Design goal:
Helix content: under 10%
Shape: globular
InterPro entries: Kunitz_inhibitor_STI-like_sf (IPR011065), Prot_inh_Kunz-lg (IPR002160)
CATH topology: Trefoil (Acidic Fibroblast Growth Factor, subunit A)
Function: Inhibits bovine trypsin, human plasma kallikrein and plasmin and weakly bovine chymotrypsin.
Strand order of the largest sheet: 2-3-11-10-9-8
Number of domains: 1
Oligomer: monomer
Number of strands: 12
Keywords: Protease inhibitor, Secreted, Serine protease inhibitor
GO molecular function: serine-type endopeptidase inhibitor activity
Strand content: 35-45%
Order of helices and strands: EEEEEEEEEEEE
CATH class: Mainly Beta
Structural class: mainly beta
Subunit structure: Monomer.
């Protein structure tokens, strides 16, 4: 499968560089952490008009290669490669369904792939590595756009090297 490219047409690096996920619609918005309702710490990933560019991410595969392809299962995380926190996971959370949230552990192979969609890319979540995955889209609740499983309604991004 194809090499994933940033907004300058360069291969997206495996962990070494961070990237903004820039929505192609939803006007201007960037990635942020929010509370869902009641939790003490904001750990739900949202797209927030008030946080542009937002929190950049790193895409990680345990394969030896220094670039990412659309075929690779990925961990995606906020923060440095060295830090255990910021790792995205998909969690059952009552208002949202299956919400994208940050965690501080990480499996050998991550839950996600980055796949070509429209003018850019979508994030796809894989309950099971040998089966079709489920598009990540946006769930609007409580004055926030939560990144959440919403198959058929993917949020489309371009990937801008945080440089």
């Amino acid at each position: 499968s194809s090499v994933v490219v940033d907004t300058n047409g360069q291969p997206v690096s495996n962990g070494a560089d961070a990237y903004y996920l820039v929505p192609v619609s939803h006007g201007h918005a960037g990635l942020a952490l929010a509370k869902i309702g009641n939790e003490a710490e904001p750990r739900a990933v949202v797209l927030d008009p008030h946080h542009r560019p937002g929190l950049p991410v790193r895409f990680e595969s345990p394969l030896r290669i220094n670039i990412i392809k659309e075929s690779y299962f990925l961990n995606i995380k906020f923060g440095p490669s060295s830090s255990d926190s910021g790792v995205w996971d998909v969690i059952q959370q009552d208002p949202i369904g299956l919400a994208v949230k940050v965690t501080d552990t990480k499996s050998l192979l991550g839950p996600f792939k980055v796949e070509k969609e429209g003018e850019g890319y979508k994030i796809v979540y894989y309950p099971e590595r040998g089966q079709t995955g489920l598009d990540i889209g946006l769930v609007h609740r409580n004055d926030k756009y939560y990144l959440a499983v919403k198959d058929g309604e993917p949020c489309v991004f371009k990937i801008r090297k945080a440089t």
